[PDB]
Amino acid sequence: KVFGRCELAAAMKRHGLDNYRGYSLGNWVCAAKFESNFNTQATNRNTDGSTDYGILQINSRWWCNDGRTPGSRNLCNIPCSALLSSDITASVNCAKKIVSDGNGMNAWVAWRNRCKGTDVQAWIRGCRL
Numbered sequence: 001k002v003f004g005r006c007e008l009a010a011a012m013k014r015h016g017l018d019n020y021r022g023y024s025l026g027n028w029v030c031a032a033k034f035e036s037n038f039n040t041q042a043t044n045r046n047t048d049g050s051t052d053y054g055i056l057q058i059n060s061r062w063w064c065n066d067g068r069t070p071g072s073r074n075l076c077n078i079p080c081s082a083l084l085s086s087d088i089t090a091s092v093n094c095a096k097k098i099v100s101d102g103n104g105m106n107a108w109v110a111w112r113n114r115c116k117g118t119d120v121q122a123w124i125r126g127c128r129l
């Protein structure tokens with residue numbers, strides 16, 4: 001599923017991501033834009049043999065099981081395919097764990113490089129939330 005911008009904002013808010021660990025909703029929307037283009041089906045292989053999955057490009061070495069990743073820990077206790085569903089629940093729950101790991105949203109490279117320090121509230125402008 002390719003979410004609309006405000007559609008994704010509303011889903012993330014309903015799931016309690018807004019202000020989670022102090023990250024306002026626009027941070028999450030911005031991260032998802034650059035990580036996946038709001039596409040739940042997005043996947044990308046990493047150099048180490050792991051793969052990133054879903055709207056927030058969650059990695060298979062630490063967080064989810066994809067059956068093919070060296071050193072997998074599956075800390076979210078889910079198949080990585082669960083992160084590709086049109087229902088973002090599993091991605092949100094796992095993102096909550098990731099952002100609580102100590103480095104906040106710096107876990108997401110695209111957030112660091114393209115969202116952090118910017119006017120992230122722009123990402124929810126116009127939305128009814």
Ligand SMILES: [Cl-]
Nearest residue numbers: 004005006007
């Ligand atoms: Cl929308």
Ligand SMILES: [Cl-]
Nearest residue numbers: 024025026121
């Ligand atoms: Cl915001």
Ligand SMILES: [Cl-]
Nearest residue numbers: 109110113114
């Ligand atoms: Cl980047």
